[PDB]
Amino acid sequence: SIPLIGERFPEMEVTTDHGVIKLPDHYVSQGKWFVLFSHPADFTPVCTTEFVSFARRYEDFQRLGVDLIGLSVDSVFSHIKWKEWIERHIGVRIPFPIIADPQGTVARRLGLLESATHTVRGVFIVDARGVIRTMLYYPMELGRLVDEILRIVKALKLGDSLKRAVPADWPNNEIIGEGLIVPPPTTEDQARARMESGQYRSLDWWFCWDTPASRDDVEEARRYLRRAAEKPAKLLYEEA
Amino acid sequence: SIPLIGERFPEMEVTTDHGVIKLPDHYVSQGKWFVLFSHPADFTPVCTTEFVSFARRYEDFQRLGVDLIGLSVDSVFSHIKWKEWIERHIGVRIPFPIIADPQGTVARRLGLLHAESATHTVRGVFIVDARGVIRTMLYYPMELGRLVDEILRIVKALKLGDSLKRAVPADWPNNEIIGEGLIVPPPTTEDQARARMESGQYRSLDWWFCWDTPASRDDVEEARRYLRRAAEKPAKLLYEEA
């Protein structure tokens, strides 16, 4: 039992290590998207690599109007100690808030409870209207690929604005490359018409598409994926 | 009301365009993992890109010991025509079964009827392991096609963590901190934390953050192959090939 895609993020006050805030209102009222990602506990290695991975892509997220907020079943005092430790031993400052959810009240509300005591790694991509657009549930033992969350919100924003659907593997789809899909006709009249305009490349009346995204939108999406695939030049346990 | 990560795949008989099968027994019996991915409807363009994308990675999945299985609310007859259409117009044959779920009985049972459908299933993905246990769930929206290379990464990483008895860091195999590193599961008692620090037998940043590099050079280069492909601009689009 969870919230559903297309539903509005459930209304709640939450305590973070930045203060008390109202969700989704806090982000909606700033016209901001948010990514809520949860963690089973403070001072755990997979969750720390993820915090560091998100911090790294903080600017990338912000440039798309996306705020980040964590969730862990540990108090605010542990959250601040954990963060301090990250900055001192890894050298990276973790700039976004983390919800303190001892009791797992928030976790329960979101159905994030293998768990019993510690909260699955759930991720909710919520748009500027408060609406849940995506949910990823990775297991406790597996860290997220954070560059895929960036690709999602980028593709999603471009779909919402260009009035287009986004092909598998976009912007590198095998069939239509960086093309974007015109939502299929839903009546025979609409189908005939669309087939008679010849205004789109097409494979059938229900598969038409064009290339409306800017060159920079495509290269930015491709840049997320490129970074996901690169062998890191020098690791951060060395920097330490 | 969805099934839960770490629960057994709900026991059920399903009708596919390859016949009637029992989930998850049918894959467990073979000691196979399976990826179940749903689709709102046959003859829809995003969902057709995804089939094509899945069929391309079909051998990659086979190599890992993973089977593929679809789910659509359409009938088995639509599934077959849709697949015939893809093979004829795209030039790609779809090798894996599609559950025919008219009425949405299977979709319901899996909580795949979300708040933008009421009628067509969300893009749900269930990665179920050889023991028939759900290990990952992905819910993409209707308008957004999956990145199938990430599905492969997950199965690959989860099979490694499982075999090597490790946890897998963000962005593996390209984690900013420990690169190809895999993580030793943290001590949960005070003695165990002390023993672990005195053993000097792992690299480490703290007693709770220890790791080695126990993954074969081929295990790793294969994980990066997935991601590199995902990053590559296709040379030749299949639309032109038609």
Added chain:
Amino acid sequence: SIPLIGERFPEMEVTTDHGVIKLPDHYVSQGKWFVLFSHPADFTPVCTTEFVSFARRYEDFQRLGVDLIGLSVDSVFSHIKWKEWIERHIGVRIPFPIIADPQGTVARRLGLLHAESATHTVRGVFIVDARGVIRTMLYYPMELGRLVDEILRIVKALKLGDSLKRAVPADWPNNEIIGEGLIVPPPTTEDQARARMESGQYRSLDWWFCWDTPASRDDVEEARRYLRRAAEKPAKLLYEEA
């Protein structure tokens, strides 16, 4: 559990391959009867034969002021492909709408999920008059196509019964007792009965069995034409012509 004869057609929005319509309002509005027929699935042979048969008889229904609407548990996109297929391989355009009912929400509301079904909807037929009231319901098995001419006979006889104030005998217009004669609703009181008999204004076998012949020759021969067609061996099959 079902709609009932004499009941108003339940109010509902439905999505068809021609768009979203309101039942029964859309037809009541226009002063039209409608015949709603349900089909287990797209790209099935019996149900394709029936589509063709209703398309052939499309003008007959227009003359009667009857619109036709189909229902199948399959997405709108399948409905459209299925119609392209019939037009392309049989050479008959299907001009009427088909409700897309993935989930079987409409099918369920109408009680069209029966015990040989579970997945796909019974072959159900609702004959609904211009007032939105159900007048006849037919439930044929999934393996047996309908006799479309009988649906025509029913509407025509019922409209004749409504307007002439008459009940229609078995097998009309070929009843073995009274041929094309129409029945006067029987008296429900003893004084009514006694008056009917003394009036001698009707042919009669008893006070409860009185009839006359008020249908025009045209009405009679139009109704017989439907059964005559149904009886005729076709003079050229569409299979060959294909």
Added chain:
Amino acid sequence: SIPLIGERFPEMEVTTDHGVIKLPDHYVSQGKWFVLFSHPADFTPVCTTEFVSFARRYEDFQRLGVDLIGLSVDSVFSHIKWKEWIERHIGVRIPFPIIADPQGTVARRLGLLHAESATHTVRGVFIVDARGVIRTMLYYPMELGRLVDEILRIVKALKLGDSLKRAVPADWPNNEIIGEGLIVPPPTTEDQARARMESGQYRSLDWWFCWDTPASRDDVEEARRYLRRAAEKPAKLLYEEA
């Protein structure tokens, strides 16, 4: 709330003017099919036309292995008096049992209490096979006599499909596409589809639409004889001969 197609006929004892019998057992145990037809009341003109029409086709049903049973909400005494009257004034003996259902316990168990109805039984027909299974249900209104030859066509065609393992096109034996051809149940797997098309043992318009012509000239002709009878003006009206 009704019995459903594919559902077993509800187990019940009924009283008729032939005696008390158990349904569907009484007929199952003889290897008989049966048609149960319900009537609003005794001594009503539409229902008398229907009884005479069934009685007239009595031997046709018997040759098909099909028994007839009526159901009216009136006592067994009224039934016999009613039958006696039909035999005296119309000259036709009604050879089959009629259920006496005062109280409407049976009507109610069967859902034959509709919304024009109140107290008198909808005009419902159940065609039940020799396994005791409901195969077809027809609901005509109070004011419209049934077409009894369509009932014979139905059981004839269902018996044919059952024994030949075939589906039956619309308007059989005069279907516009395939005439008197019967349909091969479509393939439900990709492998069956491909194999069906490789075999080349059937006429087909597609892998899901294959048929042949396995019905005997006699069976086809018998079916056409039912429809020709329904279509032709009778020579001699039983009222003239009163």
Added chain:
Amino acid sequence: SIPLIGERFPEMEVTTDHGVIKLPDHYVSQGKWFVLFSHPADFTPVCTTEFVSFARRYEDFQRLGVDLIGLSVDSVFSHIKWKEWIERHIGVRIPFPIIADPQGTVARRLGLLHAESATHTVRGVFIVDARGVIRTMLYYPMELGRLVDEILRIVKALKLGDSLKRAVPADWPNNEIIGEGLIVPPPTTEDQARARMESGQYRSLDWWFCWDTPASRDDVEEARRYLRRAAEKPAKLLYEEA
């Protein structure tokens, strides 16, 4: 579970062979009493004998201002055919209405679905005054015809009790203690009892047993006429002169 003596007759619309009427309103509105008798079924011998007996005493009822109304679980068409048979074969016209209660809605409302038959109403009588109040109820078994003269006596005696403020002793007007005398209602207080005995105005056996003879010689002899008729061997039986 039944309505009760002292209670108002249950409000209800009913259909009879003379029309639709509201009970007890149709009768109260005329300032008339009514006797409602019920009958298991039409075309039954005991029940026919009863109808004939009531028809014979019809004017005796009208002299008392009492209308008769029957009830049988059988349709209006059967009732009329049943009446028709009686007039034809026995020579007696049944002038009063009969409720057609197919389904037994009225029967259940009145508790007339007793144990000998869950299908045909017990043989019950409700005697109902001009205020719509139930004054008497009789339940005979289905095998035993009523004594209609005793119903006349009850109405007559009860109209007298009411109009004279008197109670009626056993066997009136032939009581073995006081003959045709009528009983003064007993005092309910010690002061009334004392006053009654000091007044010396009645014949008395005790303060609680007082009586006088206030009924006209006509009232008394009318009541005794009923008992005498019941006691008389009939002159000429109706079967003979059929």
Added chain:
Amino acid sequence: SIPLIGERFPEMEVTTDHGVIKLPDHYVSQGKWFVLFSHPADFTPVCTTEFVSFARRYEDFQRLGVDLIGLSVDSVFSHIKWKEWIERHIGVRIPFPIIADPQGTVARRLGLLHAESATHTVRGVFIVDARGVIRTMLYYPMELGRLVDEILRIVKALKLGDSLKRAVPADWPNNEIIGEGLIVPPPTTEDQARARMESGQYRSLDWWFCWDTPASRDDVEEARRYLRRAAEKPAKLLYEEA
């Protein structure tokens, strides 16, 4: 919520002025029928006239194999005083038991608290056979004494009907159609109805109306005598001597 005709008399222990007894067991065990009659209260005039009228007929009841038992909502000490009053002032010994029902437990079980009641028992009568089965119920108003000769006619006819296998016409032994004839219970199937007529073994008016005269002269005369005793003014009133 009354007991019902055809039902077993509800099991119960009761206290009478003759002792405690189990109903209907006390009478079933003796092979006896019984008449249970209820009374609103002790020391009341109508109920005193009934007790006397029943006492007069005690021997008529014993000869039929029938016991009498009263019921009143008053203690056993009232019953005995009341009886002693009747015997001292009227000169009639009341031989039968009266149930003492203070609290009205028995009265509620039998549903005898009717609308005029609340506190005093409706005046009801149950005629119960030697199987414990309720065969008749009369409900007379508080103000109207019963006619005891009619209760003796009912059991006499019920017994003859039970043993001869016959139904009893209205007003028996003086029915206007058939006099002292008894009715052969009607056929319930066409075959029975045909055989009955074929046989020609009975007087008849129709297949559903056959009768004969198998009751003895004595049975007939005993029953006519009850009716005669009801009809005649008694020579000598008891208040005279009393």
Added chain:
Amino acid sequence: SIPLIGERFPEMEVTTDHGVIKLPDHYVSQGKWFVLFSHPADFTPVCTTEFVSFARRYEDFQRLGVDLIGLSVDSVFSHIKWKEWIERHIGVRIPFPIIADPQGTVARRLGLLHAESATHTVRGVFIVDARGVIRTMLYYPMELGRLVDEILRIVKALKLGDSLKRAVPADWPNNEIIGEGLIVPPPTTEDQARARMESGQYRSLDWWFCWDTPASRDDVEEARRYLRRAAEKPAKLLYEEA
């Protein structure tokens, strides 16, 4: 479940052998207390001795401003015969009302159906003040007559208690510690206990045990006259002189 010391006597209408009255209203209206005593049945020996004992003390109760009302589960007609019997055979007029509680409505309302009954009301006494509040309840067994002189002592002492604001010692006016003294209600706070003691206005044994003698000599001698009378053998027994 019963009424309670300190609760209002339950609101109710009751039928007595003097007429219908409202309790406690009827006595409350007059500024009177009343004693209600119940009796299991009329024409019972203990309960007669009681009536007689209360009758003898009727003037004593009147002087106190107290009415008496009896209660018996027997009809009003029995009450009156019983009372007549007492006046006639014993020579004493029972001047006060008796409630006729047939069915025991009043008895259930008051909880007087105890275990040794189901049928007959316990021997219970309610003493109710002029405000309608129950002050005392006594429940004697059916086999033990009350001591009516103790009931007078209770109300006389309760009247002194209420008007003098005093509590009444055991066995008053003959208490072993303080004789005819009356008890000052004890202090409930420490300040109150010190105050009472330092003011030295009462005889005392402790701060919680103070008393005085505020009752007049006539009040005292009156209360003691009830008890003397209870103790003395009557100079004349009523049975001898009967």
Added chain:
Amino acid sequence: SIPLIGERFPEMEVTTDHGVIKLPDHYVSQGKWFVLFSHPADFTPVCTTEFVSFARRYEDFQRLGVDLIGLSVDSVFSHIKWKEWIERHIGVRIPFPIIADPQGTVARRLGLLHAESATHTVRGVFIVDARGVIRTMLYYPMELGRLVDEILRIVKALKLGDSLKRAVPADWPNNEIIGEGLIVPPPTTEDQARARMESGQYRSLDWWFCWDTPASRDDVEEARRYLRRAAEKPAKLLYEEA
């Protein structure tokens, strides 16, 4: 909600100032009766007067085989301090046990929480026989001390009635009608009543009012001494000599 006369005393373990005991078992086992009296609270004046009054009649209770047991909603430590107080200040040792009922558990169980308290127990008395059956209950208000001699008289009179199979008249042994006579329980059948009267075995006023004088002269004078003591002005107050 109290226990009821006739019902066995509710089984229970209680703590008293003499130890823990099971009720009624502890006294039943000894063949003793017990009187259980309740007190709202320790160190209250009316309740102290009563304790003393009981302590005074202690051997009178022993002579009858009756034990005494008090009950108060106060700890066992208060009970004992209260007893010491009475012994020290009044000179009277209280020999019987008092139940300590802090919380009111026993009191609730026995319905001893009435509507003038909710905190402190009503002043209730239960007289319980050697078989553990409740024979008498008395409820005085709190402001009114009991009359302990009336309690001795009840138990003495009850034990005599029991042993002699007699009922005891009002005011016994000083009944106005029959003096010290005891009542023969009344006959409950007509046979008993007639036999009783035929025997001339008793003095009688009627068949239901018979008596004799079976009590020994010592039983009679012992009972009357109880009452004489209650009527005697005390020759020396306990407070003076305190």
